[PDB]
Amino acid sequence: ACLEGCFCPPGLYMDERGDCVPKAQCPCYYDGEIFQPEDIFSDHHTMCYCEDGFMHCTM
Amino acid sequence: ANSWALSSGEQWCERASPPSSSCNISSGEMQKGLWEQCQLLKSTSVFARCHPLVDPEPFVALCEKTLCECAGGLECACPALL
């Protein structure tokens, strides 16, 4: 619904530490694991990175 | 291409983003009259003889996406042609 509470402006998104930040340093939550805004990351076969909040995986 | 990045101490660098093309709204006449300068890789006789050695199909493919950001010029085709 259209709820009531404490938000921050649309350019800013909520971070875990109470502050809210733009989507540049908004971490990724792949498989529960909290990855930093720039984390290149790969097993042998898969290839994954965190750009701006989303986790871009490939194969 | 972003796997083969190499940083230094003066500057550490991040993943570049693909550019958001402004061509998608400023289409207009720019694709009608300027389709020919890409096309003359295939039509003109001076280029009509490397076809058994190479294929111009990628070259014409890569030009048509860059004839759209420059305003008012046929010269925008000669880089991909050169």
From Swiss-Prot, chain B:
Question: From the record, what ranges are coiled-coil?
Answer: none
Sequence intervals crossing the membrane:
none
Give the record's glycosylation annotations as residue positions.
Answer: N24
Name of this chain's protein: von Willebrand antigen 2
Question: In which organism is this protein found?
Answer: Homo sapiens (Human)
Upper lineage ranks?
Eukaryota, Metazoa, Chordata, Craniata, Vertebrata
Q: Which residues of the full protein are shown?
A: 188 to 269 of 2813
